[PDB]
């Protein structure tokens, strides 16, 4: 590089190399290796003939700090003309003959010319070109190297060891600190004999033929195309092309008025059904009633102790058939679960985990006999009744009124805590105080919500199921559903929800599926909404005593049984649900900051402790209702939880298109004269992202209800 | 003994043999990057699984005669099949164990120890809520050392940490930077780690700059607190508060005896010449200087030889 040469050599050498390049007719930017070669050659030549003098008696001595012969005269510091003149003068006054080319220096002590060479390859090969280039004449040749080598004619180095050592060390140091910065390879691979070449690159072959037909249709050779491109001047091409284009190519704007938008069309058909992993609104718990503070045991024993606290089991019987399968298998599975839970005592050693006996009904439930067999296509080419795959158009379903009820119930408050966060250091800066009060208010408002209970349930269940699947691979293990909380007065409590029986898990990748069957307790009669439960089998198993008010009243107890299998990736997806709180806090803080940016002061006080402010987040036949800040915080948390629990691409598409439409509507409401180019296609996108998911249908209904009020 | 024996059988297989024979030292770093590209199999879950089992940590032999097998409670600390140990052994060492002086720690981690002194000797002002525009320029995150450039900082680091593996430059000049003397005197018997000391010395001695969108202070002390000073729509005001001349003649000669190490050139003689190993494998013949050979105005005096 240029900067390296600038900072390495002294300027006195530098101006001469530039003059030499100008005389030659080269450039310093295009080629740089030749610059370094000339600088090194000039430096070596100047160093080779310095601090040398010869006394009148004929002996040569080295001195530092009167009029004595210099014993050397420089020729390389001069251009061709005066170099030839001085060479002619000296050979005439000494009787010498003109050798051929320009020698480097002349020594009076031996009365003979000297040539100096520096090479990047090794000396032995480089010697021969100089030897056979100049022959049958008296001219010494000395060759150095960048790695300590040296060689001269007749092995008579007419110099002391010290100067040669200095030259060799200078060359070694320049090479050593050149190779460190990353410039030695190109410099070394740049000497093609006695010239310097920057680089080389040619097409020369199959690449040329391939490049030949990679051109516009009116060309045949790459060179002709390059020549045409090089001599290009723009006269009128763009305007001329534009003048002869048809007028149907246009982008016309149609105004967006208050009467323009129309409600979105929803699909029609049979009602939808629940498809969540665990039921949410219709669950109860069997509390363990404050275990000891030192109690930390296996979940199986906790489940057993929770079970022993209930009396009232009866003969179970089916109340709602699954209409696809065998219900006696479900009855036998439940009875086997009860029997194998009770039969623990017939063991000399108490086990840690329970492995279920492989029974016919369990095998049918887990689908261990419905595995298709795989053979090569060659033998089964002649078989009949062969289809591609399950490439069937999805069914269309309408919207029911139970998802709204679930969302309504998910935003209420409970009597437990469900979450306890740890502590941090004390605050000093005022911004730390502001952040602390913000997060303290947010934590206080949403601590006792039901969505936290759902998050904890999902995390515990997914972690336990993943651990069981990774531990045992060829056993039918029993996995309980267990959660923990703190009571109002401050007693830890453990709750049991149901049971899960896992099949066979041999997972090699992250897409393989593992099957299981789930049984859950409930008090909700399925005969009120038969359409909601379509993939469930419901049993009546016992009676429950309620202590509400005076006296004791009995209600039936039901069991919901379902067969499923999720994934290996979705277990990891379910283990991270604590991020919804973070997202809700981010949204609240973003709104606070956005409002505070305009009214340039701190708005954390006008949001929380103010009690005269209300936000419209409700609806009724009367109209639009209002609520407090805690209510909207819980609503956002519930929305995040339900978004986590009902993931689908339809949600992504609907969210994007609805975001665009909402932005257009908001632009309309600000008196900014909006406009569109194609309002329909956005709509047909919105309906084509509206196939089956009840959550997306509820979101579309919410958008329609927002639209009917936003412009009225 | 072990290393030479491991090198011997590596020559038996040819496929590795031309790898060793045809590869220069300068290309070693080219070879070192052909390792692998796939390891991240959910590291958090793997760590959680490994922390559940007993004896998940590896240690050396001598821990067998420094830590008892069982504690007062009666729990095993290490087991026999490097040996396998549990974190209980680490906690026991932190509770009961030998004590050593820690006087060298403030001299090595001083760049970290200045930050706390700057922070806890500071004061705060009010916070302003408004809108602001942030511009960009070159910001210095490491101030470095004055009167020291990037070229000789590496030289100082090599001289202090690896005195026996320097070659060519630093070995032929006749000088000594002052800071090297104090750095060698202070760390006379420091036994923490060569690599850690080298990294910390480079961190506190070498400067480097970057680009940041800062709308406040420009000096280096205002950069490390950028997360506390600026915000989306707020501004917080804050103040910090507070080796002789040698020349090489050629490669190794077989008539001048076995080569010697860098640290054994102290004896030398009054002009003897001998072989020496320098750099990462170079072997050269050296002999000291009978003169000055400096860089004074004499180099410019060559101008008298031209333009008469």
Shape of chain B: extended
Tell me the strand order in the biggest sheet of chain A.
9-14-15-13-12-11-10
Number of strands of chain A: 16
Content of β-strand of chain B: 15-25%
Give the C-alpha Rg of chain B: 28 Å
Outline the biggest β-sheet of chain A.
7 strands, antiparallel
Subcellular location (chain B): Virion; Host nucleus; Host mitochondrion
Protein name (chain B): Polymerase basic protein 2
Organism (chain B): Influenza A virus (strain A/Northern Territory/60/1968 H3N2) (Influenza A virus (strain NT60))
Motif (Nuclear localization signal) (chain B): 288-291
Which features characterize this protein?
part of a larger assembly, 2 chains, A: alpha+beta, five-stranded mixed beta sheet, elongated, B: alpha+beta, three-stranded antiparallel beta sheet, 10 strands, extended, protein binding, Polymerase acidic protein, EC 3.1.-.-, Polymerase basic protein 2
């Amino acid at each position: 590089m240029e900067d390296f040469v600038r900072q390495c050599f002294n300027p006195m050498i530098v101006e001469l190399a530039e003059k030499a390049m100008k005389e030659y007719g080269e450039d310093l930017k295009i080629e740089t290796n030749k610059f370094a070669a000339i600088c090194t050659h000039l430096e070596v030549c100047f160093m080779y003939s310095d601090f040398h003098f010869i006394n009148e008696q004929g002996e040569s001595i080295v001195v530092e700090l009167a009029l004595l012969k210099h014993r050397f005269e420089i020729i390389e510091g001069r251009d061709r003309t005066m170099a030839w003149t001085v060479v002619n003068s000296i050979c005439n006054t000494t009787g010498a003959e003109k050798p051929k080319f320009l020698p480097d220096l002349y020594d009076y002590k031996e009365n003979r010319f000297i040539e100096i060479g520096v090479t990047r390859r090794e000396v032995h090969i480089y010697y021969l070109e100089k030897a056979n280039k100049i022959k049958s004449e008296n001219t010494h040749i000395h060759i150095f190297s960048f790695t300590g080598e040296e060689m001269a004619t007749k092995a008579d180095y007419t110099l002391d060891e010290e100067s040669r050592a200095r030259i060799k060390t200078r060359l070694f140091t320049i090479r050593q600190e050149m190779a460190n910065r990353g410039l030695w390879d190109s410099f070394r691979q740049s000497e093609r004999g006695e010239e310097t070449i920057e680089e080389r690159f040619e097409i020369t072959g199959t690449m040329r033929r391939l490049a030949d037909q990679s051109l516009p249709p009116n060309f045949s050779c790459l060179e002709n195309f390059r020549a045409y491109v090089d001599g290009f001047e723009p006269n009128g091409y763009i305007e001329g092309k534009l003048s002869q284009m048809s007028k149907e190519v246009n982008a016309k704007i149609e105004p967006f008025l208050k009467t323009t938008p129309r409600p979105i069309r929803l699909p029609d058909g049979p009602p939808c059904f629940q498809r969540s992993k665990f039921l949410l609104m219709d669950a109860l718990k069997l509390s363990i009633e404050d275990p000891s503070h030192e109690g930390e045991g296996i979940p199986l024993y906790d489940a057993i102790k929770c079970m022993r606290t209930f009396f009232g089991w009866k003969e179970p019987y089916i109340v709602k058939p699954h209409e696809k399968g065998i219900n006696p298998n479900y009855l036998l599975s439940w009875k086997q679960v009860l029997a194998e839970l009770q039969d623990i005592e017939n063991e000399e050693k108490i086990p840690r985990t329970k492995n279920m006996k492989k029974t016919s009904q369990l095998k049918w439930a887990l689908g261990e006999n419905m595995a298709p067999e795989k053979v090569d296509f060659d033998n089964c080419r002649d078989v009949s009744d062969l289809k591609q795959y399950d490439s069937d158009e999805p069914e269309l379903r309408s919207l029911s009124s139970w998802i709204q009820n679930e969302f309504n119930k998910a935003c209420e408050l409970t009597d437990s805590t469900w979450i306890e966060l740890d502590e941090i250091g004390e605050d000093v800066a005022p911004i730390e105080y502001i952040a602390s009060m913000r997060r303290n208010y947010f934590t206080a408002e949403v601590s006792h919500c039901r969505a936290t209970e759902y998050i904890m349930k999902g995390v515990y269940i997914n972690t336990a199921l993943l651990n069981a699947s990774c531990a045992a691979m060829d056993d039918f293990q029993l996995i309980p559903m267990i959660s923990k909380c703190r009571t109002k007065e401050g007693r830890r409590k453990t709750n049991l929800y149901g049971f899960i029986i896992k099949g066979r898990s041999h997972l090699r990748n992250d897409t393989d599926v593992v099957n299981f069957v789930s049984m859950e307790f409930s008090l909700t009669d399925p005969r009120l909404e038969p359409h909601k439960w379509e993939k469930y089998c419901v049993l009546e198993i016992g009676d429950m005593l309620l202590r509400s008010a005076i006296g004791q009243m009995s209600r039936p107890m039901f069991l919901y049984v379902r067969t499923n299998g999720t994934s290996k990736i979705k277990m990891k997806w379910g283990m991270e649900m604590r991020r919804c709180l973070l997202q809700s806090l981010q949204q609240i803080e973003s709104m606070i900051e956005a409002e505070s940016s305009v009214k340039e002061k701190d708005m954390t006080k006008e949001f929380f402790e103010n009690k005269s402010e209300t936000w419209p987040i409700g609806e009724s036949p009367k109209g639009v209702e209002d609520g407090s800040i805690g209510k909207v915080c819980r609503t956002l948390l519930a929305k995040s939880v339900f978004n986590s629990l009902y993931a689908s691409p339809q949600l992504e598409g609907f969210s994007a298109e609805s975001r665009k439409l909402l932005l257009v509507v908001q632009a309309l409401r600000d008196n900014l004269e909006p406009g569109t180019f194609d309002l329909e296609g956005l709509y047909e996108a919105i309906e084509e992202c509206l196939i089956n998911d009840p959550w997306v249908l509820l979101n579309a209904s919410w958008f329609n209800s927002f639209l009917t009020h936003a412009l009225r | 003994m072990e290393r030479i024996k491991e090198l011997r059988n590596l020559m038996s297989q040819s496929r590795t043999r031309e790898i060793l024979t045809k590869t220069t030292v300068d290309h070693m770093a080219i070879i070192k990057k052909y390792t692998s590209g796939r390891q991240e199999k959910n590291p958090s879950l793997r760590m959680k699984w490994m922390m559940a089992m007993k004896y998940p940590i590896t240690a050396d032999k001598r821990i067998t005669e420094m830590v008892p097998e069982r504690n007062e409670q009666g729990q095993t600390l290490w087991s026999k099949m490097r040996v396998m140990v549990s974190p209980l052994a680490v906690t026991w060492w932190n509770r009961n164990g030998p004590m050593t002086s820690t006087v060298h720690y403030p001299k090595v981690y001083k760049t970290y120890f200045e930050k706390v002194e700057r922070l806890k000797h500071g004061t705060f002002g009010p916070v302003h809520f408004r809108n602001q525009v942030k511009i960009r320029r070159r910001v210095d995150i490491n101030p470095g050392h004055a009167d020291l450039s990037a070229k000789e900082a590496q030289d100082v680091i090599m001289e202090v940490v690896f005195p026996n593996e320097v070659g060519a430059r630093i070995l032929t000049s006749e000088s000594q930077l002052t800071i090297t003397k104090e750095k060698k005197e202070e760390l006379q018997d420091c036994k923490i780690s060569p690599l850690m000391v080298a990294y910390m010395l480079e961190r506190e001695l070498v400067r480097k700059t970057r680009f940041l969108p800062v709308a406040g202070g420009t000096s280096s002390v205002y950069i490390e607190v950028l997360h506390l000073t600026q915000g989306t729509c707020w501004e917080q005001m804050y103040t910090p508060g507070g080796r002789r001349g040698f020349l090489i003649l050629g490669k190794e000669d077989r008539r001048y005896g076995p080569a010697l190490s860098i640290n054994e050139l102290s004896n030398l003689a009054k002009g003897e010449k001998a072989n020496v190993l320098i750099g990462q494998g170079d072997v050269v013949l050296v002999m000291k200087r009978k003169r000055d050979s400096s860089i004074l105005t004499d180099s410019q005096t060559a101008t008298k030889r031209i333009r008469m």
